[PDB]
Design a protein around this nucleic acid. Structure first.
Lengths: 151, 141, 262
RNA sequence: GAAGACGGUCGAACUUGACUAUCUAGAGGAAGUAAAAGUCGUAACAAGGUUUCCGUAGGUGAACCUGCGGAAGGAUCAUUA
RNA sequence: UAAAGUUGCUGCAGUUAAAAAGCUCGUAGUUGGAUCUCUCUCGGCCGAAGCGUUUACUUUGAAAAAAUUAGAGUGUUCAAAGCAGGCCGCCUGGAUACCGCAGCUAGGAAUAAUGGAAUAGGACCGCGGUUCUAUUUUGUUG
RNA sequence: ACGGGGAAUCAGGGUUCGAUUCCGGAGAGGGAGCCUGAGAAACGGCUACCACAUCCAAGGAAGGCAGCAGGCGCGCAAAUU
RNA sequence: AAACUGCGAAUGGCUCAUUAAAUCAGUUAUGGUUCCUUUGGUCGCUCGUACUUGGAUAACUGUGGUAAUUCU
């Protein structure tokens, strides 16, 4: 679509799109191979990442983000930011005096690559730790599992 | 009845926290008004200048003139009534002299007959009242 | 703090140095060198506390400055020089060679070796990388860099270094069935055959090891040091062969030894 | 290549008008507590001499009184076709 | 600090001793009935053999300073200690346990939560089907 | 209120403490700004302001014990220049 | 001796004012960085007065200023 929405040109820094090609040797568009990498830890590169046109330098698959550290999960709580969502991690904290637990939660802002189209509120996301991407963001969505009630 | 649930630790902890404030001892210790109102300011002893000698009438079942002194604490300037324990020991204290005063033994509470008195003179002129009473030491001239 | 620290408190020193608590406030802070601060034995601890050749640090300095102490074939005059695992200490004046080898309790034993064994040392290769126009390079736990290693040598293998020349003369691969010592953790100083390596991508691989007496333990892969091909070590082992007796068997052995005297 | 100057930036501080706490050689009100071993009464405890008490409202030199509704913690577990 | 089961998780009280909201609804919170006993490398004993929806729990295994605490040895003259020492050069110590919670790991599968197909968008599978892998089995796009 | 390792008490559970010799942080009268250096926003380095303060021939110059002793002050409260 | 050069003076010691997810603890990460020193490697890998080049400045000598300094 309209990839060039910013004031600066948007492109994958590792893909050279200005190679000289003669006109008569054209099959489809002239030349635009798409850069992507397979992240480790058994995660599958989304098909939209391989055959997409979006430009996201913070994408785990087509961007400049290396996933290393903790692999966590959460439920999507808010999706009101650009390429960023807020997930909620619920857990039980043990108070030893009463030998009991209490519900606590942490809100975590994670980068959502546009390769995960159709991500709802309430479905599980597996996020991986990366370098600080902004003031509060340090995790990238690596997998999206749909909610149980989602048809 | 009380809640018995695996995930009621927050409720139990918060209830204990709130209901601890209804304990007199805990609230006095942890509220800060008692430490502000305490003439010693949390200290076990304090030094003062004997403003005057007073006689406090014992409470109604008893009849005696308890010999106390009005002293003014050096650390903060408050006016304290301090009992002079033994007999004739009021003769050792002279007005406008240094005196070391302790609590009366009930943590800020009046003791026995003497009403409204929670302090007792321990030393006068930097020599203990017990040494003066027994004749071990004398008042420095 | 600003900049690096230069002191080591005696109580913050590694416990395997077996320093007491009343000698002083300070422990000899190891100098920077081939081995890490907590995985080394300074020369002063070896020459004073283990060998009793000196009574004080002044006498350790007096010995070292006569150039009597060689570490890995080179004379060292630094009395806090960090000597670590597999390092060979040669004192030619007294004609004795030692190899710094862990005890089953996790301590560097005073293990005397023959002068023929003192010619070489085992080194666990820490990394392999290509640099300098295609030249392969190898880095060991001893922190020595070797150019042009054998193409079959990989990370976690063990090489044999001839101390006179410092080049690889043999190597054991990291394979199941090879003898290995443990150089860190709860099982430090134990010797056994590698049974299996469970791999955890993005985390620490765990290696299972079986003693010569049939006891099985496990460590992280970073704590495994291959010693010999098969179950035959390429170095001499201390009096305890890496078999960690339980406290009951230690008590029984001590009682049997005591009752045999008198 | 020094002094120096300009413009920035970090920026202590200064002047200026506005917003907390305590000691008092000060006033000035209605309060509480203790000693009341004093007066004026008698509200309560007995049906306490008008049963008591609750909410509310009004009025009294004071306990208190009165209206309305409620309670028995009542002085009735009961009163007869 | 214990005594204080006068802060009560264990483990207190609420008719009259202090105390249950005037009464209902109601969100969050808390708590919730029965029920369900192959290996798309196969080679003439060895390995690419799978958190196999998941979690909580439980049992492991790693990893986790020392000192302190517990605790092993050791006649400091005894002891608090110390980490020393013992035998006629030699011999032996400087152990070990514990190290909540969270994180990692691996067995169990009761208990508890959760999921699987009802609009069939269902499981196994014979038969088809319209872009396209940069290795073709030995004179190289002859 | 520096945090922790830990301490006191403790049947089980807990309660209180931890300025204090080990580890981590912070500061060097209060702020701020730097130079050198691998490493400092260093204070037994520098520059300035704020507070205090030393010598002076009145022009100027020099300061930083929450280092070890020691002094004053503070206080119930703590050692040898 | 002095002085120039080099290195250290960022360690240690003190104290607990600040500081309430801050510090700190355990756990991980740096595939997102810097690193004196130590240790090992590399150091004729560059196709273009050398049998050793230049100017200073200390210390030292000598002249001084200020009441005063680890001033100069």
């Amino acid at each position: 679509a309209d990839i060039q929405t910013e004031r600066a040109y948007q492109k994958q820094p590792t893909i050279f799109q200005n190679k000289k090609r003669v006109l008569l040797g054209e099959t489809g568009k002239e030349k635009l191979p798409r850069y992507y990498k397979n992240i480790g830890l058994g995660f599958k590169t989304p098909k939209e990442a391989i055959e997409g046109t979006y430009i996201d330098k913070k994408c785990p698959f087509t961007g400049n983000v290396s996933i290393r550290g903790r692999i966590l999960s959460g439920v999507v709580t808010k999706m009101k930011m650009q390429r960023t969502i807020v997930i909620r991690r619920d857990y039980l904290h043990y108070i030893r005096k009463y030998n009991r637990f209490e519900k606590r939660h942490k809100n975590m802002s994670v980068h959502l690559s546009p390769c995960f189209r159709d991500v709802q509120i309430g479905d599980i996301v597996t996020v991986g730790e990366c370098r600080p991407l902004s003031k509060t963001v340090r995790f990238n969505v690596l997998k999206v599992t749909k909610a149980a009630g989602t048809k | 009845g009380k809640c018995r649930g695996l995930r009621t630790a927050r409720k139990l902890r918060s209830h204990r926290r709130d209901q601890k404030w209804h304990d007199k001892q805990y609230k006095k210790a942890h509220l800060g008004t008692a430490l502000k109102a305490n003439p010693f300011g949390g200290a076990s002893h304090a030094k003062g200048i004997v403003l005057e000698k007073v006689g406090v009438e014992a409470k109604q079942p008893n009849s005696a003139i308890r010999k106390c002194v009005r002293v003014q604490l050096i650390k903060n300037g408050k006016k304290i009534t301090a009992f002079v324990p033994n007999d004739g020991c009021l003769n050792f204290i002279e007005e406008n002299d240094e005196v070391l005063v302790a609590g009366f033994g009930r943590k800020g509470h009046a003791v026995g007959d003497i009403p409204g008195v929670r302090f007792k003179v321990v030393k006068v002129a930097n020599v203990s009242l017990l040494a003066l009473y027994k004749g071990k030491k004398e008042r420095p001239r | 703090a600003r900049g690096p620290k230069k002191h080591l408190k005696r109580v913050a020193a590694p416990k395997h140095w077996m320093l007491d608590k009343l000698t002083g406030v300070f422990a000899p802070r190891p100098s920077t060198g081939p081995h890490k601060l907590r995985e080394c034995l300074p020369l002063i601890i070896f020459l004073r506390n283990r060998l009793k050749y000196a009574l004080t640090g002044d006498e350790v300095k007096k010995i070292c400055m006569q150039r009597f102490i060689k570490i890995d074939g080179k004379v060292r005059t630094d009395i806090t020089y960090p000597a670590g695992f597999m390092d060979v200490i040669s004192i030619d004046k007294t004609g004795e060679n030692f190899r710094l080898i862990y005890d089953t309790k996790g301590r560097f034993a005073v293990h005397r070796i023959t002068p023929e064994e003192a010619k070489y040392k085992l080194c666990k290769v820490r990394k392999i990388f290509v640099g300098t126009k295609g030249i392969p390079h190898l880095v060991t736990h001893d922190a020595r860099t070797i150019r042009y290693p054998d193409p079959l040598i990989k990370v976690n293998d063990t090489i044999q270094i001839d101390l006179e020349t410092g080049k690889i003369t043999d190597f054991i691969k990291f394979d199941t069935g090879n003898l290995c010592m443990v150089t860190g953790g709860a099982n430090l100083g134990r010797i056994g055959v590698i049974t299996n390596r469970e791999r955890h991508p993005g985390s620490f691989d765990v290696v299972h090891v079986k003693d010569a007496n049939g006891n099985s333990f496990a460590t992280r892969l970073s704590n495994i040091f291959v010693i010999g091909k098969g179950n035959k070590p390429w170095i001499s082992l201390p009096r305890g062969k890496g078999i960690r007796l339980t406290i009951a068997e230690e008590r029984d052995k001590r009682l049997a030894a005591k009752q045999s005297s008198g």
